[PDB]
Amino acid sequence: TIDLADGNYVVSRGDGWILSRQNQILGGSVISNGSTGIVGDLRVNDNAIPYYYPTPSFNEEYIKNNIQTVFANFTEANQIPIGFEFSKTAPSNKNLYMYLQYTYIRYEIIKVLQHEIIERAVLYVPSLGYVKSIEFNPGEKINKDFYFLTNDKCILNEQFLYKKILRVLPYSNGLYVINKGDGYIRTNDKDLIGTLLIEAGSSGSIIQPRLRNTTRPLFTTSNDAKFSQQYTEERLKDAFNVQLFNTSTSLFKFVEEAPSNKNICIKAYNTYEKYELIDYQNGSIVNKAEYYLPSLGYCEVTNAPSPESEVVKTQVAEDGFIQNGPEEEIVVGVIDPSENIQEINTAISDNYTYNIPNNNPFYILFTVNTTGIYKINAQNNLPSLKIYEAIGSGNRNFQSGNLCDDDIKAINYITGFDSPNAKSYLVVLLNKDKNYYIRVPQTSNIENQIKFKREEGDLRNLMNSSVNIIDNLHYYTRQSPDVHDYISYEFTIRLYTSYNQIGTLFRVTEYNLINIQQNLNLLNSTKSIRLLNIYILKVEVTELNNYNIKLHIDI
């Protein structure tokens, strides 16, 4: 008598099923005088073999396929040993006897016809164990229900999980790896290691001891081309220096001690750490791959519900992920393996002119000889360059007056537009220890030259900012920087911005910039300046409400 439609169904009745008559077949332990007894087992071999009970229509292959498609794949998980243990202390007057029995997960392939279950096939998958204890005295009579079980029972809560059978990211163009958090579990208990029911006064523990080091990562790419499985692994190794993907030697173990008044049920799941390898281009993601690196488990502690309160036939949730860990998101830029990385082997002293040697965008690695503010303009500022800082560089191999290539590919974007037609130059504070990359975009026949120059004073005020040389003063649109970042416009009066939300206008004296105004809110401003018929306007973004920023400049 069911309330479903006609057809076949796959049902999971949950974990915590104890078989009949198989109670004391494993043995028991007797402890006394305050001694502590620990009984455990290791689900690895010959005790992780499922028990099939097939009906004529549902054979073993049908059962296995239609159960492993929707629910946890026990075939793959049976090769990895999993340990469980129960410990109990006897009273320091009496004796305690406690015995262990395996628990199972029950799966039913059923056939509903006219709201009636007319045919059933049952699979018992070996889950963790369960220990029953009693404090006894010599000659005491113990109820026969303690030793012997006549019918299969669900010690845990019943379930009938069934299924019918048929914002604005102010990034720059490039590759990013995003650590999206830890503690991801698949739906429908597809990653559940298992459940332990700890009785009052006892303690339970579930351990993955890494006896077999293999792990199963999960991959999902939006394009097999480019973002492949090996490509994503290489980018993860470039970003977070991840070395082991399908291997791990980190044991983990969850221990729960139930109180002296009630019982506890603890469920252990395998977890994952989510990595997203986006390909942010022009304000939108053009390629995205999701990598789930096997993490170190999750433990959920619960109490048994009311006895047989209500067993509700609930459908399975859609295939997905649930994050039980803390909310995290870390973005790390990665050098595109596409481009070549030229190196400047000599530390830039006070002035340098790197002569650019194909026509493809590339990287130039360099370090300065003294921490200071540098201008990195190009030949006539025709190519707009970008600058990145190598994360973690400068805390290792060091050679005075030379570039020690620490082969770091995890770059942090500093400043620079991606527009290939805008004329601009960078003004950046560079540390002596750290190493910096300069991305030159797609070049053309002009040789061009990147000019580094020590800027002491004057232009040393637009630090970590790109200044675009507007030579047509009308509005200009650029890649808006993030909050608390800087942009600048140099032009030969109404000044404001369209979408985004400080500001400062300096007059240049050929530079010797002198401030004329400050704290100018450019968000839909309507004030006037009436400057004398060359000035530089520096804007700091306080609220990134759009990918681009528009510089409305009206005479």
């Binding site: 410990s87 303690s203 001891p209 006896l211 221990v255 001690e257």
Partner: protein
């Protein structure tokens, strides 16, 4: 024994059924495909022999050609032919028994790094937290330290 036939020379290297492995301990590497448990197929000429040999040696029955099994088309044809031959052998009972014996007759492994096969050492890991009785350092898990130590 089921000979896996869903393989091709263009199959991606999944490190589970299609691999690239080093030839003994030389500088050569080669591509191998798993068609059965512990049975692999490498659709290319043997690395050890010199594909070009002096005419002086050239043993009788000496069809010699250095351009055989060079293109990927010939390699895929060779792999398919070997899979078909293995399926032909596996069809009957004598061939199935022979292939199962080949797949189960693993070379005898060496013992632990100290010699012997009897039993490994023991590790005590995962001490329970303290309580009213406290010092539960001994209440923990027991682990075979080298697992599959052979």
């Amino acid at each position: 024994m089921n000979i896996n036939d869903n393989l091709s020379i263009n199959s991606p290297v999944d490190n589970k059924n299609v691999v690239v492995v080093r030839a003994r301990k030389t500088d050569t590497v080669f591509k191998a495909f798993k068609v059965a448990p512990n049975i692999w197929v490498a659709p290319e000429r043997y690395y050890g022999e010199s594909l070009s040999i002096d005419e002086e040696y050239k043993v009788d029955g000496g069809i010699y050609d250095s351009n055989f099994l060079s293109q990927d088309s010939e390699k895929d044809k060779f792999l398919q032919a070997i899979i078909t031959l293995l399926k032909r052998i596996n069809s009957t009972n004598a061939g199935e028994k022979l292939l199962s014996l080949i797949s189960t007759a693993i070379p005898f492994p060496y013992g632990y790094i100290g010699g012997g096969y009897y039993a490994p050492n023991m590790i005590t890991f995962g001490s329970a937290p303290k309580s009213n009785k406290k010092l539960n350092s001994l209440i923990s898990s027991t682990i075979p330290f080298p697992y599959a130590g052979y």
